[PDB]
Amino acid sequence: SGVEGAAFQSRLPHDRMTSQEAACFPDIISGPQQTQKVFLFIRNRTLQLWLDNPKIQLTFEATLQQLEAPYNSDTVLVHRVHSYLERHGLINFGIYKRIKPLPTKKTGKVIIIGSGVSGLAAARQLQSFGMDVTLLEARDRVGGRVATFRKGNYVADLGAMVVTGLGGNPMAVVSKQVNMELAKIKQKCPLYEANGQAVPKEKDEMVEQEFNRLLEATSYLSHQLDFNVLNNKPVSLGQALEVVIQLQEKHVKDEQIEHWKKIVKTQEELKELLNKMVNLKEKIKELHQQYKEADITAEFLVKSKHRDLTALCKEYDELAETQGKLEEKLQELEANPPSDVYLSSRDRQILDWHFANLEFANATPLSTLSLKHWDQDDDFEFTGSHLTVRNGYSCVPVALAEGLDIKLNTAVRQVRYTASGCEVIAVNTRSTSQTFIYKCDAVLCTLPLGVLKQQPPAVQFVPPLPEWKTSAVQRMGFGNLNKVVLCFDRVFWDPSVNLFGHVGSTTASRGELFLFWNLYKAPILLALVAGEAAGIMENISDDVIVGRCLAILKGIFGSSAVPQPKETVVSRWRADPWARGSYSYVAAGSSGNDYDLMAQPITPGPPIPRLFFAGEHTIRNYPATVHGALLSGLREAGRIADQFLGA
Ligand SMILES: [C]C1=C([C])[C]=C2C(=[C]1)N([C][C]([O])[C]([O])[C]([O])[C]OP([O])(=O)OP([O])(=O)O[C][C]1O[C](N3[C]=NC4=C3N=[C]N=C4[N])[C]([O])[C]1[O])C1=NC(=O)[N]C(=O)C1=N2C(=O)[C][C]C1=C(F)[C]=C(Br)C(F)=[C]1
């Protein structure tokens, strides 16, 4: 429906109040049923007015205008709902035309660390809420792990590039605001063995089906058999995968054993039978010989001896009947063996492709993932096809940055927080002699988890962060994933296909250049380096890793079809000191709860919160994404405004 759809698009149930709404509106839940229905309608229709036209600010007055009777009559409740939705960033978020220009005297001074999507989203909110906001960004650009290469007509995303579903996705709103050109990803992804041969359809299908089968087995082990802690250690997804493969190998070998036993037994029966038919030919040879040796006792003798001779033949002809029905049963058995192996050597390599794809999706080798929790975010997937940003995802943070006080080339080195306020200390990345000191009432830290894990610390906290936060930083996974960009002057691949896969020769290197993306207007390919290969490959110079791309592609389309690229780019996110990786993942021995702990603000001991945290690693239901980064900034802006302007 329509107002129904607005709730859905806001990740809210259209027909009941959430717990957050129940806290901010206790008189509503405690009150008559009909009025709680009134609340839900005001909320849904207010979301719908906004989502219908997310390019201009939706004011209280304008909401009151467009409410039909009797709703437009309950002026106070409308204001309460509008204010709540605005405060929590469910309306008037992203970038939109302000109706009321910004309050001229600010209230409260917030420093935001980092100018990625989480920091920008929070920043625009705090500025709308009337606060003095400055961002400190260490790079010479905004966007952080949204990073787009642009030169000539070439566009290519080195960080995030995929928009997941649009249903429920806040990026659907930002896309409308920023005029993002999205494009649904076509599902077809042909695979080429390491020699360049296409994987036949039967094998692509067969192997993929066994991949889905194996993964659900690990989920059955985890969530039905509690196979989660083994010998004091938490089970990794990769470890579970080796277990369920080992059992399929055992089953294959068992039916092979039973089959050899059927054969031997039937062979022994034939062996025994043929010997026994032999002794009956000897018994007939010995009676046949007495038949030519042949009076009324000799007259009756022939009848008796013919009766005798032809009865042993009826024994023998009958046995050659059983002789047939055996060597038939035998002949069929040598014809229909069960499988000799669970996975042929090529089958295994193809299967390792699908594992690599999963190491791509999680930015880490499977042996590092929590078996129990690595997909704990799946209940929150958006609906609709996934899309790529044909014009470069940077358009989002660049649009978000408009009008913000953003200080680039300004690297934070120490964050001091006390009951009386905060001081952020930064150096200029261009003249590290130059030092700045930023007094403020609160600090929002969107530093990536990779930077927080850095030992010795890139950024120092005074006082040090509490143990409960630092141990969560240490538990959580921070993965890695890299891209090679190949720009050509001509398209030599299939333009109808967005994706094709390269199947590697070994398990350990299964993620090296395993997936190619065809996303853009100019002749560009992205190749992913995933899993174990991600971090190791950063140690290869661009020229050589590109040479290896060109070799794979020349294997697939021929050596004459692949010209030398005109421009190349290679990401190295792990060695990037402003990132130290690509995104978080749920490590074995962590859980979604560490994402809540990460979001927890800090209060210096007796008191009011001072140090706040946003970023993809702080949002339990949408981690490792752009939209989760965005939602996390919006959340912290609400939390900070509640504290410094009133709830
Ligand atoms: C890297 C990457 C790649 C390569 C790819 C991708 C990605 C990544 N992803 C993820 C995203 O991107 C993320 O999450 C976001 O971006 C977030 O963000 P934040 O949180 O905001 O962070 P950043 O950006 O980084 O920011 C921060 C800042 O800070 C700064 N600094 C540092 N240090 C310092 C500073 N400042 C001052 N001082 C100092 N000291 C920096 O520089 C920055 O700026 C993604 N996502 C999405 O959504 N999509 C996509 O596509 C992506 N990608 C891939 O490809 C895949 C992934 C994924 C997907 F797709 C899906 C899903 Br469900 C998942 F999970 C994932």
Curated annotation (Swiss-Prot):
One record GO biological process: positive regulation of epithelial to mesenchymal transition
Location of the region described as Demethylase activity in the Swiss-Prot/TrEMBL record: 129-647
Reaction(s) this enzyme catalyzes, per UniProt: N(6),N(6)-dimethyl-L-lysyl(4)-[histone H3] + 2 A + 2 H2O = L-lysyl(4)-[histone H3] + 2 formaldehyde + 2 AH2
Tissue: Ubiquitously expressed.
Subcellular location: Nucleus; Chromosome
Disorder named in the UniProt entry: Cleft palate, psychomotor retardation, and distinctive facial features: A syndrome characterized by cleft palate, developmental delay, psychomotor retardation, and facial dysmorphic features including a prominent forehead, slightly arched eyebrows, elongated palpebral fissures, a wide nasal bridge, thin lips, and widely spaced teeth. Cleft palate is a congenital fissure of the soft and/or hard palate, due to faulty fusion. ACTH-independent macronodular adrenal hyperplasia 3: A form of macronodular adrenal hyperplasia, a rare adrenal defect characterized by multiple, bilateral, non-pigmented, benign, adrenocortical nodules. It results in excessive production of cortisol leading to ACTH-independent Cushing syndrome. Clinical manifestations of Cushing syndrome include facial and truncal obesity, abdominal striae, muscular weakness, osteoporosis, arterial hypertension, diabetes. AIMAH3 affected individuals have low fasting cortisol and ACTH, but excess cortisol is secreted after eating.
Function: Histone demethylase that can demethylate both 'Lys-4' (H3K4me) and 'Lys-9' (H3K9me) of histone H3, thereby acting as a coactivator or a corepressor, depending on the context. Acts by oxidizing the substrate by FAD to generate the corresponding imine that is subsequently hydrolyzed. Acts as a corepressor by mediating demethylation of H3K4me, a specific tag for epigenetic transcriptional activation. Demethylates both mono- (H3K4me1) and di-methylated (H3K4me2) H3K4me. May play a role in the repression of neuronal genes.
Official protein name in the record: Lysine-specific histone demethylase 1A
Lineage, broadest ranks: Eukaryota, Metazoa, Chordata, Craniata, Vertebrata
